[PDB]
Amino acid sequence: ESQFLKEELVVAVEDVRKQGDLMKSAAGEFADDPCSSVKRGNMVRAARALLSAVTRLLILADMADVYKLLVQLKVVEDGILKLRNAGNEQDLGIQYKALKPEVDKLNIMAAKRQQELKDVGNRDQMAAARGILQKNVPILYTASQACLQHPDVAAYKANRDLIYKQLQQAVTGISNAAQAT
Amino acid sequence: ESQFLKEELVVAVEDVRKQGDLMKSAAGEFADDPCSSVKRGNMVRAARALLSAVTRLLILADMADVYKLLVQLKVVEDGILKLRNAGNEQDLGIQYKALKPEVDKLNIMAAKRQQELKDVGNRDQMAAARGILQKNVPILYTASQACLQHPDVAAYKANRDLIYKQLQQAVTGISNAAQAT
Secondary structure, eight states, X not given: OOTHHHXXXXXXXXXXXXXXXXXXXXXXXXXXXXXXXXXXXXXXXXXXXXXXXXXXXXXXXXXXXXXXHHHHHHHHHHHHHHHHTOOSHHHHHHHHHHHHHHHHHHHHHHHHHHHHOSSHHHHHHHHHHHHHHHHHHHHHHHHHHHHHHSTTOHHHHHHHHHHHHHHHHHHHHHHHHHXXX | OOTHHHHHHHXXXXXXXXHHHHHHHHHHHHHHSTTXXXXXXXXXXXXXXXXXXXXXXXXXXXXXXXXXXHHHHHHHHHHHHHHHTOOSHHHHHHHHHHHHHHHHHHHHHHHHHHHHOSSHHHHHHXXXXXXXXXXXXXXXXXXXXXXHHSTTOHHHHHHHHHHHHHHHHHHHHHHHHHTOO
């Protein structure tokens, strides 16, 4: 986690609040005296400063969201690899327990963004990626489990790592789409 | 003249005023409860609507200015042609009187925009164009005057029309630069 962005985000809201005031008054003085040269330009320069403040806010707010998502992402990432490298059906069962929820949270956040991404293509990648992720997390479990029981069947290891590979890919796919709009 | 834009411009200021309010409150509720999911999104959607309203305003305000300038422009335009086609040193002297001020007003407005245009090149065209305009309006007078005194000297007519041509060009140059930034 990193709340430096949540802190920055509030400060941003202040400038938007201050500028918003200066805008309100300049706007008022203009409405009462609309044929006024001076009063008008003051309203324009106000509107400009209000615009900068507002875009700086919207952009920053978007980072905050994407970032938040990416952190849940790196969590699930390391989980998948820790699940693969499990050496006992002990730690393996331990991990899967710790990871399942972390996969669910990531799934939720993922869904949300999916909604906000504008172009539908990206929205599809998100959906698809979240699907594979959803389906294989369990399968990777049963797969890397088998390898632990039949240590000499190279065929199982190959299978497991293929599932892991695809799973990791879905994770990045989610990350990739998440930064679309 | 056309004040439909001055009217539209006020209505525009209202939406910016209304949205500005909705922004202020959503912004406030967020600052008091910043870790809030809901309160936050409300602040974002507010900021969006505030942004549309503000840009719609700034653009419209810019048209209003450019348009205003263009109207003084069409005035000076017809003046220059009416000065050329004068048939007596009577009407000619009449026109020049009526036009001189109209050239000065146009000159003032021109100067202003010059300041606001961002890229310097355009700012130069404006300056240059305003210069030629400034210098030749008088010369066109003395020129189209001579033609009236020596009606059979094709050479004078040629000269006069050349001055008129250049003068008209400066006018359009002003118009052209004025719509730069």
